[PDB]
Amino acid sequence: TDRMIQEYVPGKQVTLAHLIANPGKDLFKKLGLQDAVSAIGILTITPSEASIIACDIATKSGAVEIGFLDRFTGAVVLTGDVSAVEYALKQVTRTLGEMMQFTTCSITRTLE
Amino acid sequence: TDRMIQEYVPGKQVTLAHLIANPGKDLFKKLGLQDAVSAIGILTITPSEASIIACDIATKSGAVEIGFLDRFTGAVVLTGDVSAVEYALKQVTRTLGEMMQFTTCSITRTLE
Amino acid sequence: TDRMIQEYVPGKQVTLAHLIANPGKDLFKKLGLQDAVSAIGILTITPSEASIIACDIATKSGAVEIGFLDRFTGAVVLTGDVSAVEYALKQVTRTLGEMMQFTTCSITRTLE
Amino acid sequence: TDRMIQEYVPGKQVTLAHLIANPGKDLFKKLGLQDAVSAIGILTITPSEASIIACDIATKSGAVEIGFLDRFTGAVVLTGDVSAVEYALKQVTRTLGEMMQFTTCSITRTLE
Amino acid sequence: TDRMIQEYVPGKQVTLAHLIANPGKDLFKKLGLQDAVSAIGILTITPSEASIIACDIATKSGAVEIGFLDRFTGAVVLTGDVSAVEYALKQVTRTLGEMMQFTTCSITRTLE
Amino acid sequence: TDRMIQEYVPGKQVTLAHLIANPGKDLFKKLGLQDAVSAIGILTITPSEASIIACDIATKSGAVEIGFLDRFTGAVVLTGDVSAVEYALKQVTRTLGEMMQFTTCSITRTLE
């Protein structure tokens, strides 16, 4: 019944920052990832273009590679040593949140 | 008509977690699923990237396979023994809900 | 002027459940439907993945076939005898609404 | 900044129902329309699947053809005699509005 | 925390109506525009199908051509003499706003 | 659960205006950018078509090139001398904000 006009603009938020230490080979391949299976870091970012910035921060933080960047949805999958990927995820959230005023989530993990 | 700016960000929610014990061959095929027809588990997840995590929790929970993952829509279809898929769905919802503050739905079933 | 953050999640709703007893051949073909022209049942479902469940309920209800399933938008077109398609549409809304707490619309028809 | 979860579902609305008596050949061609240029009727419909119903009501109302149907966006372009397309647009809006509780717009025209 | 269902329908609005007298050749080509570089008129229109109407009004207003029409997003790029394109943009906003009750923006320009 | 109809229209906003002085070669390549790696400027703009205007303001402001434009998402990536890209980003935000009533973000930078 009640009616309203909504002007949409993207928010600034890292919704997910999640570590999987030992993902399955099938999951890894279904994501289109190449190289030996490794730990992955998974980011959900709005606006979608901030994925570019998260990639730069992450790869500059240590020996982490971009598994994939999706500038259309904001998704980023990072690869590398599990502790390095964790450090990257932390740097991404630290930088976006503290220096660019994004809402950020805590780093979450799947280690088993 | 009232007017408001709405900054969009994805929520954190498992909206569907549904078991179909005996899906028809046509459906199973229209979904692009391969192998013999089996029970399927159907998940709807926001943000879409959390489908990756749900897949990991599911395949680690027992003898359940990824039928498909859609990181763009957040859909996951799981395959395996009906009881194993059921356990996987419960583990996805238990884990995302209790450990990651997602809103979760109850597990629903089509057994006939 | 006024500003708000909106966390989006899909609702649970069957918005359309509509019967067309005698659709035109041009409409039928433009929808990419095969076989002899027949009555059609048209569903609009959120979240999109619940289209899979609606298909299963519908095809289990009687001699109704999936014309198409669209798991990306939630659209389902059913085909068969007009009264069978009507029964299917009713079973879909009955099951989603009563057992899965979806908001459901009434079955609507175009018989002429 | 205030924050809210918004569960999305499509509304039921015909937002545009517009007659162009004499569209230019370039436009008619940029729309992918075939046959000789004719008057066109333009519909915007939510939910998108209701475009199927609008098409049926239109073609059954008289000598009007589907130029195209888009079940993804809900767009319908109708073709035929300008007066017949006009009658079709009025029948789409009368039927969806009175019989199916859609919000409907007034019919608008470009006659020059 | 707080939760609401939002039934979405498109608004009726021309958000952008902007003139660029001398766009760069690289910008012109990246937009996929053909012919000699010329001034461009840029429209943002909701619902997306109203782009069709804006095109018709614009091309009927004088010697303005459709650079492109995007019925999926509502974008229209017009080409021609800078003053003619300006006149077109004004006719589009005049007609949609005054005769079809769209919210319209003012015409904005980049002349240098 | 409360319910409301929301008519959607795009807002007018520059959400991101970000300088990366030294992006890695892999990122630069994953973005589909050609030529030698250079500093990049990253814009997020609503409505998406305003990316066209931002491009024009940027290339006219000095020796800055369009790496890419995305009129569907509103993304712009600029390339050139780090100081020139910075000036371009400031001119995009100054111009859209002061002359066209867009909400604008502050310019942000990754210099390390």
From Swiss-Prot, chains A, B, C, D, E, F:
- Where is this chain primarily localised? other
Q: Which of UniProt's keywords are assigned here?
A: Bacterial microcompartment, Transport
Where's the BMC circularly permuted domain? Answer: 3-102
Task: Read off the SMART domains from this record.
Answer: BMC
A Pfam match: BMC
Q: What induces it?
A: BMC production is induced by growth on 1,2-PD vitamin B12 medium.
Q: How can this protein be applied?
A: Artificial BMCs can be made in E.coli by expressing pduA-pduB/B'-pduT-pduU-pduN-pduJ-pduK (in this order). Enzymes can be targeted to the BMC, and appear to be encapsulated within it.
Q: What's the superkingdom here? A: Bacteria
Q: In which pathway does it act?
A: Polyol metabolism; 1,2-propanediol degradation
What are the subcellular locations of this protein? Bacterial microcompartment
One GO CC term on file: propanediol degradation polyhedral organelle
User: Which InterPro entries does this entry report, sorted A to Z?
Assistant: BMC_CP, BMC_dom, CcmK-like_sf, EutS/PduU/CutR
Gene disruption: observed consequences:
No visible effect on BMC morphology. Slight growth impairment on 1,2-propanediol and vitamin B12.
Alphabetical GO biological process terms: propanediol catabolic process
- Which family is this sequence assigned to? Belongs to the EutS/PduU family.
Additional remark text: Bacterial microcompartments (BMC) 100-200 nm in cross section are formed during aerobic growth on minimal 1,2-PD-B12 or anaerobic growth on 1,2-PD-tetrathionate medium, but not during aerobic growth on glucose, anerobic growth on glucose or pyruvate-tetrathionate. BMCs can constitute up to 10% of total cell protein.
Q: How does it assemble?
A: Homohexamer with a central pore lined by a beta-barrel. Hexamers pack into a loose array. Interacts with PduV, probably via the beta-barrel which is predicted by modeling to be on the exterior of the BMC.
The free-text domain note is: One side of the hexamer is concave which is lined by hydrophobic residues, the other side has a slightly protruding, 6-stranded beta-barrel which is occluded in PDB:3CGI by side chains.
Purpose? A minor shell protein of the bacterial microcompartment (BMC) dedicated to 1,2-propanediol (1,2-PD) degradation. The isolated BMC shell component protein ratio for J:A:B':B:K:T:U is approximately 15:10:7:6:1:1:2. Not required for structural integrity of BMCs nor to mitigate propionaldehyde toxicity, may selectively transport specific metabolites. Proteins such as this one with circularly permuted BMC domains may play a key role in conferring heterogeneity and flexibility in this BMC. The 1,2-PD-specific bacterial microcompartment (BMC) concentrates low levels of 1,2-PD catabolic enzymes, concentrates volatile reaction intermediates thus enhancing pathway flux and keeps the level of toxic, mutagenic propionaldehyde low.
Q: What is this protein called?
A: Bacterial microcompartment shell protein PduU
Which organism is the protein's source? Salmonella typhimurium (strain LT2 / SGSC1412 / ATCC 700720)
Gene expressing this chain = pduU
